[PDB]
Amino acid sequence: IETPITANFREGLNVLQYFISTHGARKGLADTALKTANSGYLTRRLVDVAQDLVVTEDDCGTHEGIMMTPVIEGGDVKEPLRDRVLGRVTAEDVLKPGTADILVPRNTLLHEQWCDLLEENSVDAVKVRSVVSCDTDFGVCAHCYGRDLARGHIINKGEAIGVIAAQSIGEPGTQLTMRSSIQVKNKGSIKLSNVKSVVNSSGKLVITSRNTELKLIDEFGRTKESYKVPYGAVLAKGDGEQVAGGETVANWDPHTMPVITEVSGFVRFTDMIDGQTITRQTDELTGL
């Protein structure tokens, strides 16, 4: 509503302002009612799909795990490496960039001292053993799960983790809701990923790919900015270079799909017959 409520609860509220407040309040109450109605059924389906998975061995004996990197939406780093690789057994043994020097062995539970020693050396991506890549027939081994959450040590042989997992996912379901360019902030080296780029006549670096992802590598190894770069975007910089803060390095058109080229030559028409393939539509009020 374009005319806001200019009155607080210490002063009065007249009749219309209190009526608009009632719109908001009853919308919230009906949200909470039907929200609980969906949340309980979500907890039911999750504890009935898990239901059975018991920590039934002590070492599966594989290596392939998932790669834990800090998540980067394109602003501040939302979830750091300490809060993701806290207490989970490493897949491949992490070597510090003093290559052929082992920092952690390949079956070490990463508790808080090890996570601080990960944060000091600025470790890129601690590849770690996940439950989904296990090898235990009819159950899940103990090392691929991790720390016993709610306790300190490794998981005991036996605790039913499917049920505590399904309750931990469905329990905050009561709280949930129901119904142009690239601007940099920090400073560091510039990384490009999955790019097919070429040089324009202006001397810049233009792109011939939709799958281009720009990254900002910081001073110690990790990444603090990531940007999906569109098709045919124009960079003011290149790969491996150095920028400063507040410097927009890319620009494109979100309305137009550019069909930019690679080689320099004349333009001709092939299989373009007028009247059928191309039509004659004169732009009336502009001219071109």
Partner 1 sequence: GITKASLATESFISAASFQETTRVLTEAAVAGKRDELRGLKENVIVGRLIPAGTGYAYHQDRMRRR
Partner 2 sequence: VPLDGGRFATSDLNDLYRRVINRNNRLKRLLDLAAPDIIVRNEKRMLQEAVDALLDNGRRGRAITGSNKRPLKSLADMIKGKQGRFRQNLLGKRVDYSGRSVITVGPYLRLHQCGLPKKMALELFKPFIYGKLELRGLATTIKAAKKMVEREEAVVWDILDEVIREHPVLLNRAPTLHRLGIQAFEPVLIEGKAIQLHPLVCAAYNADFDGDQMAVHVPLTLEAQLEARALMMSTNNILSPANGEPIIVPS
Partner 3 sequence: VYSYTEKKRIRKDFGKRPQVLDVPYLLSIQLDSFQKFIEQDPEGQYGLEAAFRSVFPIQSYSGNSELQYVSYRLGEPVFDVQECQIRGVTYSAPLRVKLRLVIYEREAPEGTVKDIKEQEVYMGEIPLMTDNGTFVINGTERVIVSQLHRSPGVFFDSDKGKTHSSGKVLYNARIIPYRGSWLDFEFDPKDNLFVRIDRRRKLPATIILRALNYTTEQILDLFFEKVIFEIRDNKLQMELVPERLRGETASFDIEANGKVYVEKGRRITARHIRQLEKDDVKLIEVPVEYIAGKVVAKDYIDESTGELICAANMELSLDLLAKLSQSGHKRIETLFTNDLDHGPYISETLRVDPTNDRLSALVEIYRMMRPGEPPTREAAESLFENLFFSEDRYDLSAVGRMKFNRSLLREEIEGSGILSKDDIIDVMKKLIDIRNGKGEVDDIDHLGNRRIRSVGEMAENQFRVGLVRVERAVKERLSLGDLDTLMPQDMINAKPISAAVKEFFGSSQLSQFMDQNNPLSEITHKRRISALGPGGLTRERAGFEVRDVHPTHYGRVCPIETPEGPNIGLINSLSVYAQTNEYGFLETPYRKVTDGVVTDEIHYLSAIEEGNYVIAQANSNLDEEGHFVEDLVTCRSKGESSLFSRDQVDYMDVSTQQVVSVGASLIPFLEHDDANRALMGANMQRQAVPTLRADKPLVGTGMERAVAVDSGVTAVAKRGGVVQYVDASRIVIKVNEDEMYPGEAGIDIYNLTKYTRSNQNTCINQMPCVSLGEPVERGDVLADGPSTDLGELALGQNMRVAFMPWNGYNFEDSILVSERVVQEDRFTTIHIQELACVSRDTKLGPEEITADIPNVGEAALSKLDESGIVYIGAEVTGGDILVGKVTPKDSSLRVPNGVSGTVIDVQVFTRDGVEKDKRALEIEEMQLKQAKKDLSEELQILEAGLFSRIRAVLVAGGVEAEKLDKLPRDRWLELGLTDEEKQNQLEQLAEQYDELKHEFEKKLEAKRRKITQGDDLAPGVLKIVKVYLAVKRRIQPGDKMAGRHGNKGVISKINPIEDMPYDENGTPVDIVLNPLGVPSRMNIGQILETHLGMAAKGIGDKINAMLKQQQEVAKLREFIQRAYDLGADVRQKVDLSTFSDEEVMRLAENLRKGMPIATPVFDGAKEAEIKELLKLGDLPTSGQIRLYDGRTGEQFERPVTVGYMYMLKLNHLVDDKMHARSTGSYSLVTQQPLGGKAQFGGQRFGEMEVWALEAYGAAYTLQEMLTVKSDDVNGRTKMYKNIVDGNHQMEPGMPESFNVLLKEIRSLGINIELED
Partner DNA sequence: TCATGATCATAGGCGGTAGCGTGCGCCAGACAGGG
Partner DNA sequence: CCCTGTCTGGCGTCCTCTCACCCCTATGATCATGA
Listing DSSP states for 194-231 in one string gives S--EEE-SSSSEEE--SSEEEEEE-SSS-EEEEEEE-T
Q: Considering only residues 86, 109, 125, 217, which one is a binding residue for partner 2 as defined by CB under 8 A?
A: 86
Residue 76 near residue 115 (C-beta atoms within 8 A): no
- Size of residue set near partner 1 by CB under 8 A: 12
Q: Which is nearer to partner 1, 159 or 218 (CB)?
A: 159
For residue 242, the cross-strand partners are: 189
Q: Which is nearer to DNA, 32 or 194 (CB)?
A: 32
Residue 179 near residue 34 (C-beta atoms within 8 A): no
Residue 213 near residue 181 (C-beta atoms within 8 A): no
The 225-264 contact track toward partner 2, x by CB under 8 A, reads ----------------------------------------
Q: Which is nearer to partner 2, 174 or 200 (CB)?
A: 174
Phi-psi region of 138 (alpha: psi -120 to 50; beta: other; left: phi over 0): left
169 binds partner 3 (CB under 8 A): no
Q: Which is nearer to partner 3, 78 or 157 (CB)?
A: 157
Stretch that binds partner 2, among 61-69, 162-170, 207-215, 219-227 (CB under 8 A): 162-170
Query: Measured from the CB of residue 285, what is the shortest distance to partner 3 in angstroms?
Result: 14
Q: Considering only residues 39, 46, 85, 212, which one is a binding residue for partner 1 as defined by CB under 8 A?
A: 46
Terminal Cα distance for the chain, rounded? 45
The vertex-148 CA angle with 93 and 46, nearest 5°, equals 110
Stretch that binds DNA, among 16-24, 40-48, 75-83, 195-203 (CB under 7 A): 40-48
